[PDB]
């Protein structure tokens, strides 16, 4: 990818860049999944051994406070602002808010809301004053790359994201192991109840949670499962990674072309009855200038 920016890249020291990041040592892990109920068109498989070079990855998704600092320093205008609208979950749109009649095929719970963007996540009249340490949302893949580059970082590849999210466990279902709520404790912010009609908020949150909510995984990362989808660097495909080759097994970058970029981790809207995509092997995609109330990102860096 060759992005274009209207701000200069500031100088930063290695110690500044590494703050809030964990160092993942070079090594191998088993990427992918073989859950029999996986949508075969997501390409969760095959399970494969991948070798990665050492990298740094953020413990937390990028927060509102951090994104605000980026925008203050650069004047950056997000894709949602240029388009003038972004996607908000229906239950979060305040009655009377102007809404577009647009329908996302097969997903009528999404509402295109003029004026919804990172600083007004539910549209005009909403704010992030009470959400400084929540993940920034309504950020597109382009916005994420812009932030990451300004910060001296980059987006993780899907394999880097998944190695870090797995937190040192071999082929577990979730970042922490194989039970969704071990010892009856909620470990991530997803949906409980009847999707899309009623979220019971059993896990504490019916929207985003702070980036440091819940216990971390074994590598110190927080909310890799649930909370917000997280953009990764790779172009999406369902089958590029089915090939056995150095390109797909050593520091894999994904296909060289595509139309949508990979997103990982699931969000506060995920539920087993619909999209069971908070499993660490799960994956989906979105087009790179798209944005939504349940999608953000975390950064990676070369040491």
């Amino acid at each position: 990818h060759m992005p274009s920016f209207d701000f200069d890249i500031p100088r930063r020291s290695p110690q500044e860049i590494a703050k809030g990041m964990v160092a993942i040592p070079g090594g191998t892990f088993r990427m992918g999944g073989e859950d029999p109920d996986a949508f075969p068109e997501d390409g969760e498989g095959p399970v494969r051994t991948v070798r990665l070079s050492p990298f740094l990855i953020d413990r937390y998704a990028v927060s509102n406070r951090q994104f605000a600092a980026f925008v203050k320093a650069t004047g950056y205008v997000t894709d949602a602002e240029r388009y003038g609208w972004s996607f908000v979950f229906h239950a979060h749109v305040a009655p009377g808010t102007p809404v577009m009649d647009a329908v996302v095929p097969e997903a009528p719970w999404w509402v295109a809301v003029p004026g919804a963007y990172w600083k007004a996540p539910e549209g005009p009249g909403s704010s992030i004053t009470d959400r400084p340490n929540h993940p920034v949302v309504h950020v597109s893949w382009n916005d994420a790359v812009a932030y990451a580059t300004w910060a001296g970082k980059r987006l993780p590849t899907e394999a880097e994201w998944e190695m870090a999210a797995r937190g040192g466990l071999d082929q577990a279902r979730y970042p922490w192991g194989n039970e969704l709520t071990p010892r009856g404790r909620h470990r991530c912010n997803i949906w409980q109840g009847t999707f899309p009609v009623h979220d019971t908020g059993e896990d504490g949150y019916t929207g985003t949670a702070p980036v440091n909510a819940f216990a971390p995984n074994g590598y110190g990362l927080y909310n890799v499962a649930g909370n917000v989808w997280e953009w990764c660097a790779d172009w999406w495909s369902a089958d590029w990674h089915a090939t056995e080759s150095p390109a797909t097994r050593i520091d894999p970058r994904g296909p060289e072309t595509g139309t949508a970029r990979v997103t990982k981790g699931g969000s506060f809207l995920c539920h087993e009855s619909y999209c069971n995509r908070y499993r660490v092997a799960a994956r989906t995609c979105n087009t790179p200038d798209s944005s939504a109330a349940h999608t953000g990102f975390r950064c990676a860096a070369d040491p």
């Binding site: 996607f87 996302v104 095929p105 097969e106 949508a260 979105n286 200038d289």
Partner: peptide
Amino acid sequence: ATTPLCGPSRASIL
């Protein structure tokens, strides 16, 4: 009925 949708795209509404 079809693959569940988690990522709503700007193109999808056109």
